[PDB]
Amino acid sequence: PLIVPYNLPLPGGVVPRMLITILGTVKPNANRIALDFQRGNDVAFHFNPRFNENNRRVIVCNTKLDNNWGREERQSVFPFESGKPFKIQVLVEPDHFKVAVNDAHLLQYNHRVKKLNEISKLGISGDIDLTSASYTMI
Numbered sequence: 816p817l818i819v820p821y822n823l824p825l826p827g828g829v830v831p832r833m834l835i836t837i838l839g840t841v842k843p844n845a846n847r848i849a850l851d852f853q854r855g856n857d858v859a860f861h862f863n864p865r866f867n868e869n870n871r872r873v874i875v876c877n878t879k880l881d882n883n884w885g886r887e888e889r890q891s892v893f894p895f896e897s898g899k900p901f902k903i904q905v906l907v908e909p910d911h912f913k914v915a916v917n918d919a920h921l922l923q924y925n926h927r928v929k930k931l932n933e934i935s936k937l938g939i940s941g942d943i944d945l946t947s948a949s950y951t952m953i
């Protein structure tokens with residue numbers, strides 16, 4: 816398995832039609848996972864499954880600019896499961912990141928950070944065994 820937290824460079828930044836695929840297995844009794852598409856110190860797109868936020872499972876998405884988190888976007892569809900293998904696919908579209916988990920569409924996140932070419936790394940962290948992290952053009 817790859818060492819978590821893992822940094823996946825995205826050479827030249829992201830572009831529409833770029834597909835990022837992450838395979839891993841959630842740890843037993845997981846608490847949290849995060850994907851962080853980063854523009855330097857800023858987080859263009861934070862995708863954060865929370866397994867126990869006041870006894871609810873929720874995905875929180877947000878952007879961090881100059882160390883400040885913005886408005887959260889929340890999704891109660893929660894496709895992750897402690898102990899089980901998952902696939903996350905993040906497709907960059909012109910106006911949003913489009914996320915599918917286990918081949919089912921989950922959410923879209925409109926681009927707040929609009930310099931897509933400057934979003935040139937992806938951090939993967941939290942309560943997973945990480946099998947692979949890669950990208951391709953579709």
Ligand SMILES: Cc1ccc(S[C@@H]2O[C@H](CO)[C@H](O)[C@H](n3cc(-c4ccc(F)c(C)c4)nn3)[C@H]2O)cc1
Pocket residue numbers: 847848849861863875876877884885887940941942
């Ligand atoms: C005013 C204010 C008060 C409280 C908060 S809470 C904050 O909410 C953000 C989304 O709005 C992020 O989720 C933040 N966050 C989560 C993680 C994280 C996730 C998974 C992981 F596996 C690792 C290693 C780290 N890192 N930062 C989280 O602290 C926010 C604003």
Ligand SMILES: [Cl-]
Pocket residue numbers: 847863865
């Ligand atoms: Cl969290």
